[PDB]
Ligand binder design. Structure first.
Ligand code: ADN
Length: 265
């Protein structure tokens, strides 16, 4: 229940983040393989994330889902923060997107279904992720999608804010500073589905200021190859009005999703 660094053997780095680095690790006692994410307190303090970390650790620990990355434990070096995480052999969706350039409809539909299932579970338990991007999505050995990086996640409805980072996956309401609900995740689902098929985010721009306008205006276009079934789901998800956005169940039962999805709703 209480861990120390000595209990682990550290391997190659899985990932780097401004706050920290993620390492492959093996628990000595069990030979269990897992990902160890290392954060210095000092980097952490300057930003007011110390409370943010507490929210991430608590929510992820008590959540159990096939499509949600598992947090096994946490401990603190003097002074470093260590997170013990499930290890995903197939890596990030973001990496997969770079290699394939774009995802086929069958693969896209499956990720959405898995995402939707995980989100339904999250929403049921009163959790909203609020930050869903391919960099935050991991792949299981079976190749199943697993959601991760719950830091920005919070209980809703809530007012938690845009200043620090890229706006590509943020809803108009969050960027505009209006209070937001679970619908924020539905918007994210719409952005991801578009990015998977097109290979780029719908509101992507050279400029932060320009992206802000695109999101607020909600002006996006479809390449010719995107199917009408795909367009319909995307258009429904990307709605300036959160109330107009469909429920997760609606997404799961959508004809395009049902037809092209390997995994059942
Ligand atoms: N368990 C893990 N397996 C593989 N990569 C991971 C894991 N946890 C975090 N990462 C990587 O480290 C980054 C920081 O969380 C992620 O965006 C991802 O690239």
């Amino acid at each position: 229940r209480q861990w120390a660094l000595e209990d682990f053997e550290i391997g190659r780095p899985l990932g780097k983040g401004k706050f920290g680095n993620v390492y492959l690790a093996r628990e000595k006692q069990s030979k269990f393989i897992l990902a160890l994410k290392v954060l210095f307190k000092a980097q952490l303090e300057k930003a007011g994330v110390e409370h943010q970390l507490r929210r991430e650790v608590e929510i992820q620990s008590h959540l159990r889902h096939p499509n949600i990355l598992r947090l096994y434990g946490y401990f603190h070096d003097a002074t470093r923060v260590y997170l013990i995480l499930e290890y995903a052999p197939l890596g990030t969706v973001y990496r997969e997107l770079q290699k394939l350039s774009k995802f086929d409809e069958q693969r896209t539909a499956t990720y959405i279904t898995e995402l939707a299932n995980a989100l339904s579970y999250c929403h049921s338990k009163r959790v909203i992720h609020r930050d869903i991007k391919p960099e935050n999505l991991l792949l299981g050995s079976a190749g199943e999608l697993k959601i991760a990086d719950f830091g920005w996640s919070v209980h809703a409805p809530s007012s938690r804010r845009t200043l620090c980072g890229t706006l590509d996956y943020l809803p108009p309401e969050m960027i505009e500073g209006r209070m937001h609900d679970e619908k924020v995740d539905l918007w994210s689902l719409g952005v991801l589905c578009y990015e998977f098929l097109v290979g780029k985010p719908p509101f992507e721009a050279n400029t932060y200021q320009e992206t802000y306008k695109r999101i607020s205006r909600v002006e996006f276009t479809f390449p010719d190859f995107v199917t009408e079934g795909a367009r319909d789901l995307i258009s429904r998800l990307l709605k300036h009005n959160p109330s107009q956005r469909p429920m997760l169940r609606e997404v799961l039962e959508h004809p395009w999703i049902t037809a092209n999805s390997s995994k059942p709703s």
